[PDB]
Symmetry: D2
Subunit: 239 residues, 4 copies
């Protein structure tokens, strides 16, 4: 037994979180719109969807923003083997993103398992959404500084210093009002399997039919999870 981590295991429910490694460098100089490129955001959501459709593993849904994708598993893949889950999921993702963006140089996702109890699941996504807010503010904040001749580390030390209302002020003197930007930049996107009422003509027959069908749907206008609308939304995705 020299493969000492190979038997290491988790139990459901579990979230797998995958995060782009150093995308700011490995995707630099490739022509992506700054500070937000909607083609990239589509590729991330499409990557989560491809995983849900073709990976053979069965997550309830995915949640993505910036460079991260979180999957919730109630049914554990590979008998819960941690090395196998982390490596295979991160690998499928690196390959799927590489196909969606037609990359010519390789990228990598990391992966980690988040060990949760059922009742803790909504709070996990609260925290991820709060991080999406913080990344929203930082990405625009950074963008604005750099446009004001700022330097790399200069803008970095800057952002840590001030406060959100402050950074809002600076953003405002550069013509940027964060309340005008699309919901998804600050809230992220949800990808899940859905069943919906379907009434159509059979492609072969072609008789009228109500035989229902399945689809993977991307939701680009999600509520804030920790809110009036958000609580039943999240609990519905989880069951």
């Amino acid at each position: 037994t020299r493969e000492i981590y190979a038997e290491m295991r988790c139990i459901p429910p579990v979230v797998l979180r995958a995060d782009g490694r150093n995308f700011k460098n490995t995707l630099s100089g490739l022509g992506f719109e700054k500070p937000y490129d909607k083609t990239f955001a589509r590729a991330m959501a499409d990557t989560a969807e491809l995983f849900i459709k073709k990976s053979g593993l069965s997550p309830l849904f995915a949640y993505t923003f910036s460079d991260e994708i979180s999957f919730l598993f109630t049914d554990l893949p590979f008998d819960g083997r941690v090395e196998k889950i982390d490596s295979v999921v991160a690998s499928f993702l690196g390959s799927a993103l590489t196909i969606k963006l037609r990359l010519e140089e390789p990228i990598a996702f990391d992966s980690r398992l988040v060990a949760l109890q059922k009742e803790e699941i909504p709070e996990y996504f609260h925290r991820r959404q709060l991080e999406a807010w913080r990344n929203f503010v930082a990405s625009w904040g950074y963008y604005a500084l750099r446009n004001e001749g700022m330097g790399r580390n200069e803008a970095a030390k800057y952002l840590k210093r001030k406060k959100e209302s402050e950074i809002h002020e600076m953003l405002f003197e550069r013509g940027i009002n964060l309340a005008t930007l699309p919901s998804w930049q600050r809230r992220g996107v949800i990808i899940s399997k859905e069943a919906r009422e379907i009434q159509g003509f059979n492609p072969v027959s072609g008789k009228e039919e109500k035989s229902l069908r399945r689809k993977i749907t991307q939701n680009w206008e999600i509520p804030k999870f920790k809110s009036e609308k958000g609580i039943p939304f999240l609990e519905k995705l989880i069951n």
Copy 2:
């Protein structure tokens, strides 16, 4: 977070990472690769290993690949020895690189695992690998020749388990297939290493006269 409980799982040098293609015979079907071996697939694997040594930012001593697998030797541990990080990032990078080398239309995936070794056991690790390369070589060609006789899928699979290697060899030899002279990379695998990065497609058996100091040079 204290919910990321595997995140501090760690390892110590030296370590071997072994990545292995998940279900490639289904997911790479439809590229119409030649049976039972396709040197285009093998160039892609070796190139993938080379791209990793060049551009991953991690510092493996060398790589050893055959079939769907690639082993990397690290004496210098990436990510402070963090297992989840090492396994996930390395499998992900390889998945990205191979997807590029083959310009795939559908996604593939590598798995990944750490092999903990003492410095003195390192040669024996690669010997065990090369021996699995040989065993997989024999089985593939055996399977191929059988199927080409009109053998059924499962039936050929049974024949291979029943008979000994010596009989499969004789069987291949009757039909015009000589295991000893088929290309080296199929029988023994390929070594990718720095000094510039070089792919050695004609390697010695590791526990032979020339093989013993060949491996020690790679390990230093």
Copy 3:
């Protein structure tokens, strides 16, 4: 240190710790315990579990013991969920306590393991334990009666594997031993819990009419 690589291995609540006596039938021989069960040994185990709940500083919800084993339920995780620490300190404390309760002259040892559970699976865990208590009960008495017929060590061991439980029962019944009325603690084990700390030597079967809410009260 970064060489103490298991030291951050962690777990999340709720958890069950199960400690089990290592090789007691050799190491506690020479105390001349009555076969096949000795209530002095069982008082020592239950007292040991009570001493742990009282004086260990850790906060288990309750304990469940039979044979050489003790299970503890924690919803509040000791040592921030650190596995090496939890397993080592709990097994050590138990080893010390049992060594006191029996005033031993030679050292014994418990092993220890964490059982990761979801809150809803907790009742089923103890049901599986109680079922192992029943199975061990049957096997012990069967072994005892056989040996007392002039059966050989290994031979009695064979008989027990061959025959079904229904036959071992009938066999015990022929000889005057009635499994149904032998003391409850032997058949079902003992529960030790706070409210003051109480040892319940007469517990329900956990998945019966009275058992179902009995377990839920212990779990809260």
Copy 4:
């Protein structure tokens, strides 16, 4: 598989380090001489010896000082299962110490595995011996302060503050010179199996005999490991 840590493994060589948990409280008020009780130190060494003799596990040797015992394993017990090694060793130790000291209330050792490479082993014991030095100084230092009407936390904040030459000075104004104390208080004790030349009369025969025999020996006068004498000493114990 709910026993998720049960398959977790290590490879040789490995050191198991066991440390008394809170002995300062659980052994308080029991009548042990302060700040050093040689009966306690004998019990620790005898406990390591009992482990080496009766546990069935095969460590090359043990090293003990204050409340800790380190075992070096080249042959891994229980197929290298971490939960089993940590629990069983700590348990055997808690029971053996409880027998040696005839305790009436229970104690506990913790246990941790130290994953090492062969060439790293001497340096591990260097560090442990350096910690033995530091504990030597702290135990006497603390003892002296308390005798000078000092308080618990008062003496604690004190010890962290000053330096060894300073603490030596304070020790000196209380009549204490650390160079006069026994080597073992500052260097620890080594317990190992040894073979030695034996010439005696057979207890049964009783003919003169040279048939050699084995013994476990405690060495209470060990060298400093990282020194002229110490280097071949340690390398000899390890091989």
